[PDB]
Amino acid sequence: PASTYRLQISAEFTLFDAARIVPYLHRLGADWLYLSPLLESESGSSHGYDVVDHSRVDAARGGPEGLAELSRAAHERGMGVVVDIVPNHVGVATPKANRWWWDVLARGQRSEYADYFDIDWEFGGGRLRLPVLGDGPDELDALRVDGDELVYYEHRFPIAEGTGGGTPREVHDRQHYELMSWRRADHDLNYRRFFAVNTLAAVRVEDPRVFDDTHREIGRWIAEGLVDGLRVDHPDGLRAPGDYLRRLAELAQGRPIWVEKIIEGDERMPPQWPIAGTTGYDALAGIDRVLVDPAGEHPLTQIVDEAAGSPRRWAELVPERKRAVARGILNSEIRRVARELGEVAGDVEDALVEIAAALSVYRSYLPFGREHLDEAVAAAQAAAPQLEADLAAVGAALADPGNPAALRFQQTSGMIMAKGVEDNAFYRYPRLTSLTEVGGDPSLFAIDAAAFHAAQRDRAARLPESMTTLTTHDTKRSEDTRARITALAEAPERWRRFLTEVGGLIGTGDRVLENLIWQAIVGAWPASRERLEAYALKAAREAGESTDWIDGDPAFEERLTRLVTVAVEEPLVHELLERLVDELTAAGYSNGLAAKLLQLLAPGTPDVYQGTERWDRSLVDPDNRRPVDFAAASELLDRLDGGWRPPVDETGAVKTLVVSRALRLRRDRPELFTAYHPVTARGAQAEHLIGFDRGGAIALATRLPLGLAAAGGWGDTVVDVGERSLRDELTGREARGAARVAELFADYPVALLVET
Template sequence: MTFPRATLRLQLHEGFTFDDALAQLDYFAALGVSHLYLSPITTAQPGSMHGYDTVDYGTVSEERGGEAALRRLADALHARGMGLIVDLVPNHMGVGGAHNAWWLDILEWGRHSAFARHFDVDWHSPDPVLRGKVLMPCLGAQYGEELAAGRIALKFDAALARFFVQYGPHVCPICPIDYATLLQSAGHADLDALAAPFQGLTTQPDDQTRAAIARDALRAFVELEGTAAIDSALQSWSGADAVTRERLHRLLDRQHFRLAWWRTATDEVNWRRFFDVSALAGVRVERHDVFEAVHKLVFRLYAEGVIDGLRIDHIDGLADPREYCERLRQRLMSLRAQPPYLVVEKILAHGEPLREDWPVQGTTGYDFMNDVGALLHDPAGAAPLAESWAAISGQDWPFARIALDARREVLAAYLAAELDHAARALHRIAREQPATRDFTYASVHRVVAQLAMHFPVYRIYPVNGLRGQEDNPWFDLALQAARQAVPRASLAALDQVDAWLGARAPDVENGNGAKPARAAQASTNAGAQTGNGGGTSKQAVQNPAPAPLSHALIAQRTALTLFSQLTAPLAAKATEDTALYRYGRLLSRNEVGADPDDFARSVEEFHADNALRQRRFPYAMLATATHDHKRGEDVRARLAVLSEIAPEWSATLRAWSTLNQPHRRNDATPSSSSSPGSVAGEWAPGPAAEAMLYQTLVGCWPPELDAGDEARVRELAERVARWQLKALREAKLRTNWLAPNEAYESDCQAFLFDILAPQRRDGFLQALATFVARIAPAGAVNTLLQTVLRLTSPGVPDLYQGTELWDLSLVDPDNRRPVDFALRAAALDQGAPATKLAQWRDAHVKQATIAHLLALRARAPELLREGEYWPLEVRGALAAHALAFARRHGNTWAVVISTRHAAALLEGDLPLVESTRWDGTAVVLPKGCPAADLHDWLSDAKRAATKHDQDNVLYLRDVLSAMPVAVLSNLTPA
């Protein structure tokens, strides 16, 4: 298989398996994608709906159908000339429950487990109670309470001949060192004999082998005699009374794990988590043995031709993403001559490029989603919408200020343990040199916190412990902000931490831990530089074999890794999972990978971004919807229209708030409608939450929904209620996940159901439906513009499951709901998009646009995937309302022309600007691009020659007469 022309992402789980995907393959092929792009296929926690909680990297998930079903799907794809890309999660594994053999072995044998180095566990915790142990923060209440309640129970697994402690679904194996004591507690002669081989065991590898032999004997006894004697022994360790409970407690204290209340994780967890999720443990994939174990299955599947490429999840969680990508590509290329297709999930800040020394095809498309999203917004709406939001929320801060406050809170309340790990790594460096030993832990912790809080990007990517030219501008922004924030007495510590975090190489000989020269060129020492265009390596001059690393350099690299693995989750949790739920100027710019302060982009900026992608990463994915988006692509497209009618929207918000005031809970004084525990004067949902609720309803209201349809309105209300609960908790203002304010949450839900109640059909419901009907045509124009740009811009378009019709989804799990593929298959025909525009509410015009442009991509794969990109000039009175560019490959051309910011131009119900409105507005074609005999792939009509062709211009009144978008080419359908 070659690189993809277009991919279609599927979310697999036990309710949608490989065979379910196989059943829809005819539809996927007819739609025109070249590759399916699957969510993780490895074995995950039972019942996982997403697959990102892998428990076994070596097997294909049986819940998703197993390897046989995967191969059936792959064979059917390959028979159709299609391919398969799979999502891989190398950064973390699921460790909750009882199914991760690596993790269970660690709990059993501690630091001497064969898998002790597979995870980022700090075996030398500063807390004496945790030294040599793994914190297991899985208890629903405090340890003593759960122990006394008998919910922590000692049990025996006869099949494995293993003693373990169980708490709900969580299993923690007892170390065999204690088996002798457990077996002897029964006072049973046979068990006493079986206990003898366990006497004197240690955790050393040889003794682990002895323990396995002793367990075989125990298993054989149980198979013959049953477990009655062992069940009797277990009574001596029951939590039922004080004596046996104390004995159980002492047994637990001797284990290599410490059971703890889940809230302790924030402050005390001694292993790297995925963000703040204590059921996901970070994997040390930078180690060679771990790398091989994590990738064993995908290497085999790739070598055998089952899969054709990989999507790497959360690349920023890895210790060294560049080195990882380099190693992964080299291994895959050793297995097959064909270059592998590799893309990485990477969030890029505004102005931050993807590193060119990463040997990947590009990102999974969040950057493009942001580019096209910003293009849809009218910059004239930014100021009035900001004023309106300030009046509603009482805050006139920019989003950056909101995000900074969120970072401060998240760092203190959710990632305190991760901050502590990074600070302690740096403090250890301080203690090793006489010149720096007086820098205290508190001073180091203080400055590291400020650096992390002000870090403008997810992380940096030093090489050999040193920052390079690409790292320094970002780090310097954080450094300058930290200088303003820390006390003057901490500035010396800040300068020293700057050095330890890669500004200078350690110099042990001088005893000061730092060299004077800044390592500005560190990235040139990274070894082989790798290009991206065709996925093949462009080898730079090879470095000689590296000398053994000094202890000082190892310590500096460790500190840099821990700092980078702090800033990345901090950015995600504070920005995506907190600040984006607090700031509501316009929710269509509150998206993963976006910055709400970067409100709108000009056509020129969009062209520049596309041209850069074409030069650097022509095979990067182009996404407008993902399994992680906050709002569906068509929700965002419709909400963007509000930027064009900002004054009207502000007035509408005020009117709706007044209309619905009687339904507020606890407005000024407690009332019978308020939930117990409500606070007088703190009405629910509150002005900011209410305003964001209205935006959400406007964005996700189906265009064909009648306000009088009680069943469908109720269904919508239930979906929005699930979004609302998540949004309120993520905002962490009046409720949160750690300590939910259920009274407030109940009041907010009651408000939502009240304003959408059937009796409001002539009031708010009708007002809502009428307003949506007014802006929906302009939203549909935006949808078609966004769709065309995704399918014609440089890169590989990615379709998220089901979004070929309306994507009015909200944040997960709403965006992972079952997809009615039968409905979509029935709707797909050969009709041109233009013939479906009149019935645009059924979204068949969107589906047809996708199918026709995918057909163009199949007709000339190189044209739209890696062809040249030519921004085109638009002239005339309405030039600001159009966007145009051309793609060229050899003598083949495609000209893309689209309507934008159409709200003021539309008349009536059709998402199409009347031809006469365009007047003399025209697109100037580049030299060599024919003006005559161009086929419009969206109207399926050939453009007739006109008297203006010698001027090499295309008038919008002609090319946009049937559709608000046009894709013209000198190629015709096959």
Template sequence: MNRPLVATYRLQFREGTDFAAASELAPYLKKLGVSHFYASPIFAASPGSTHGYDVVDYNRFEADLGGDPGFTAMSDALTREDLGLILDFVPNHMGVSPENGWWEDVLAWGRESRHATTFDIAWDAEKILVPVLGKPYGEALADGDLKVVVEPERARFRFDAGGYQLPIDPRSLGHVFGFLEHEERDRLNRRFAVATPVDGDELTERLREHLGDAGFQSALTHAVEAINGDRTALHGLHEAQNWRLAWWRTAREKLTYRRFFEIADLIGVRQEIRHVFRDSHRTVIRLAKERRLDGIRIDHVDGLADPKNYLLDLRQAFQSARRDPLIYVEKILTGEERLRTSWDIQGTTGYEFITALSGLYVDATKEEAMAEAYADFLGEVEDLRGMIKRQKRSIFARNLAGELAYLTGEALDVAARGLSTRDLGPDTIQRSIVEVAASLPVYRTYVGVDGVPTKDVAIIDAAVAEAKSGREVEADEPIEFIGRLLKLDFEEAADVAGALNFTRRFQQTTGAVMAKAVEDTVFYRYNRLIALNEVGGEPDHYGAELAAFHEAMRIRVEDQPEGLLATSTHDTKRGEDARARLYTLSEAPERWETIVAKGTETLGAFRHQIEPLLVSPDPATEWGFYQSLLGVLPADFDPKDRKTLAEIETRLLAFVEKAVREAKRYTSWTSPAEDYESALKGFVSAALDPANGFLETFWQEVQPFVAAGALNSLSQVIVKMAAPGVPDIYQGTEFYDLSLVDPDNRRPIDFSARVKAMDEAMSMPEAFRHWRDGRIKAKVTAASLKARQREPELFTRGDYLPLAVEGPLADHVIAFARLREEAAAIAVAPRMSLKLLADCGTIMPGEGCWGDTAIRLTGPLIGRDWEDVLDKGMLALDDRLRLGDLPGKLPFAFLLAS
């Protein structure tokens, strides 16, 4: 539990990766140099889950991964290599599945269930809506899709809806027993009719005894057949349940429980209730007590009713077990937003670091040229901020209509008690809620029983002002009323309670509105430079001054020195090296425009008219496709390699389908447009067919971007390894990561190649000259981690010192130092690599290109001996470090003095 924080290594379980595979990987991770193994969710999840975020049991390890024995063996393997374990934990929601015992109990017993308060259910609704039918309920009943089944081996009755099964309330089984021709019929009727939840096990035992009698079992089989053949009786049984089956399309507007985003198969968990918290965290607390857990990553912390107090409860629960593991949260910080230091955690998972990095490598001076090229290709100028606001309105009003209806009801209850608000109607209130949510610049605010933080007052007031200025609601008063609710601005206890209820649910919903509207819609529509369309990113923040990056790092030292530094995750829209390559387009928009123009001409025959005003691919999708193609092609790609081509085609076809469905412009997941999608896929396949003459020419013309992208990739590694925080390495990204969005970024990893790279005796300059194979990235990563192992505190809590660069190529360099007591480090990395390589004519600019460009050293950095971390050796420095003198003539450096 006291392991120094060096770096984490994230591994995705499932899809062929289990505890045994992770155990075998432990020696490699130790050799690579990380300190902590960071595991994706490993608790029991819904059958067939590919990710584990649909957990069904917080206290049971997934059997398919190896169960309890497999976990223990993995834990022991990590301990032998002195690696800590960080678990990805999902407190906000659970999977709605027959494997979820808590959910099953709620469905069977309704509000009398011992778990009735576990889930965020609207118990004032008549029934728990279960929207799983492929057609309206009446049609499903008439078509024979519904039936009762008996599971003799488990001694229970189930209501089957086309393969989806639900528990039957034991008190309603009289509907079945009424068809039973057996002497036990009346006794069973009476016994089950008066049952309570505590009788559950006894009822199961008695039913199992009866089923052991062949005569009873035969009679019950006939009874079940009879009720299944009687649609009226079957409907009567259905109506006697605590749940109601419904058409899946009903979920968005009538769902009676809080979902995760718009996914009906994930139900919100009420962690604010003490017994729920205790029951769901029992195993992770035990693991910490047993020294098998060193840290925990909290998924979707913004979905919780009260994140601050949840994290306080978590910290206290660990401390009660005399342990103090690391706590990280999946929290997306936008704009000027900073992590709430009152949460007392190590930090976020690091999406804000990706945003800061993008500012380093995107050329802000060329934004206008790229905007013009994009607008010319589209034939229109897109308004990103307007697009975002429209999509937030649409997502809230349509996809999350059920949540909006709930909030409207809560607001109306408070409004009805006020003389100045009693005349506000449901439509006005609803539109006001939508406008305030659409105007919110952050994922959520954090108002709760502890009060209204000053930061949130300012955010709410600004959102209210913007909502009023939009004039989507005719009067200011209803919008101001929503602002009062969010600030708990009431005197009467009933009104304050109502405002708290409204605000809790509003805050849990706005994160979903933001994520679905921006990350899962607009980021697939607005394709000017898709490298900026990243989780937590803002595509109209196009590059930044070096000072902005230095300020972001200063804030990291202040707010979260032990926060994670992410560059790729399971949720990023594309791999870190695909982004690094695509950043270079910003340096030459005119050249990119020319390449795209040639492509559109060559592939013109494969673009199809779908309807009068729609072609496939549409312009925005086609512009984005060329970028995606550039981002996914391996650096050592050979256009004549049919096997690699086939793999890339398969990946891109899956990606474009997801992209256009997420964009929800001409097709969607719920209503696929077959003609549009078929034409789009045909276009993609044609682009990758060597016979059509596009791909080979495209690959030749983008080579400058590929080389500059590789230099950006290595620069990004240096910056990440020396920046304040803890580098998080996503599985396999020691080599180039040119992944597309999930599920592409969960493909199996060839770890044998990575193990081999660790053992190869090759100098850093030699590896750099073979940059296309990716080994150079692995070598830089491993060497940098060794430096962090020696001085872990230097790289987390050490001071961050920007270093001035002078000379003709100063704009192509970022340099900074880290200082803590006697230890110090210097990081030097290139930027704006496309122009740098164009001017130098080689990917080795250290060989005579830098001229008199130098880094100015100050104070405690002067007159010390420095170790070259990357390729060993020592050098002594005065007050200047010339770029031409960097070790190995490399265009980057990592130096350490202690």
């Protein structure tokens, strides 16, 4: 595909609703639709990752008739369809809705589905532990019997055959499941789950029986020509992702497969994987970092370190926070690997925690990635010399793929990375929160144009079909929120002054968190009090420093809610905020356009999240899944195609112009995309030009717009565009040879030159 356009399908936006906006998406220039998970999922699921019935398309989403209509609308226009599929786990929030899980609760190990799940029956004393009770004492007094079902408030469970008797507690003691406090999931869970979400139970898709049953309807989509590609959710939780992908590629009949897989730095995936590439976070990281002014690193870091009283060091934060999740909410997983190892040493658990903390990647794929494991063991031995011998012993066992503990550990270290780093350490390291993003290393503050270009060349050389992305349903902050936040690296003294002035009026007791919160408010502005308050509570709990998800601090949380209320409604704070936003608005627009144009023309397959053809100033899930006004966007595009040339403003029309012209170009004139050459400027402001030539199309953008403005604009600066005449797709303006950047960017901070 020339591009993909991601749609959140749900009961609020069904496959039939999607089919009705297919014409608009074709008009916009989208090539393939990228659909969220479609198999039958938990009633009311807005996301579809909690599958309950693999046999059919989810009825709330339109069912098989909806998929047939959507696929027909797209294919009759020459468009394609790639579907998000979820192989690792199923939804068990409502046990009755999941007939496989219900059967295991009713029959235990005699169930035909018992080995569809990953259950440590022996650790459970022969019972499957369900962490659904409240933490209060005497909680099973609420347990009642109703027919052949045990009931705990709204939860219902099967009473095994012939186990009915007298007293709910008595009946409960003979079941193949054991209801227990939700708190016991940290250490006593005996089934594999997705991260620490107890209502998502893993399925052993490495078993061909289970692959067949969970993929039969997906396979019908391929076989009957309804879908043209697949996106694999969370392959790093699978026991054998290489074998999984090999089986899927045959099921997909050689159609493209992308994997949601987080890359650390210059890590490479196993080359044998029959995939088109990733969903694009590795691309996101390079695009954001070429727009960060590297001179901001030290000042923005000092703002955090002074607020915190001791330096926030990413080299300390990552191992510490990974250690903490491995000893806390993910300890059940750690203990299970240690049971599988046996007493290969004392302190097996402690060795595992140290090795996971030191691991530099999400996971190995042994024998691939063995070097990452060896480095982690050596690093752990340096960090915990008292454990040197145990780390040696445990590391040697973890290095053998014929060792089941080694494979379970590969299924665990990525959970520890995601929950320790992305969902915790990120929120403790806010010197520039646009860099704390899925797939990013926030200690890598900026990259220069040369490094940016090398990143693009690498993708062109090894992953030419891989996705690039700037916003997804899982990003911490959407692309235009980050675009404005990134402008803070050009004005660190102005940011320090803002925090000082606004901090003279309101505060929470956590000045480090307030820096993170104010960046989000400034980047999302304007945003409702309700959205900002919801964001602030979530970010504070992710950080876990002044409140958390388990035992929060309500007094602190109300200081946080009040800070948000004051930002929106108190005259002086509100004015200080609006003034700063005004100062940063042009720069944020410039950065947003630069990121969007560079991403859409870069090597790979650009993905476009729903609605991001206009400004998207969303925050974290669920704020980045608000409903999209396709009608408004269609009208904007209609005016652009009517010849209207917009100013750069809050309507986002200039962004719809950039997105539509770039998508259409990639889709309808693919002969213009044959190579990748950096385009560098000459003159006083040359460093502010970032651009490249794909063959017959040149992407040109601005970086560091506040510095450019302060310097007086472009001045004498020129780009040599070639001995060829080219025309700007966004303005009609022509350029040949040495073109003044002040003319190329006379209307927009961005230009799309097409050879003539």
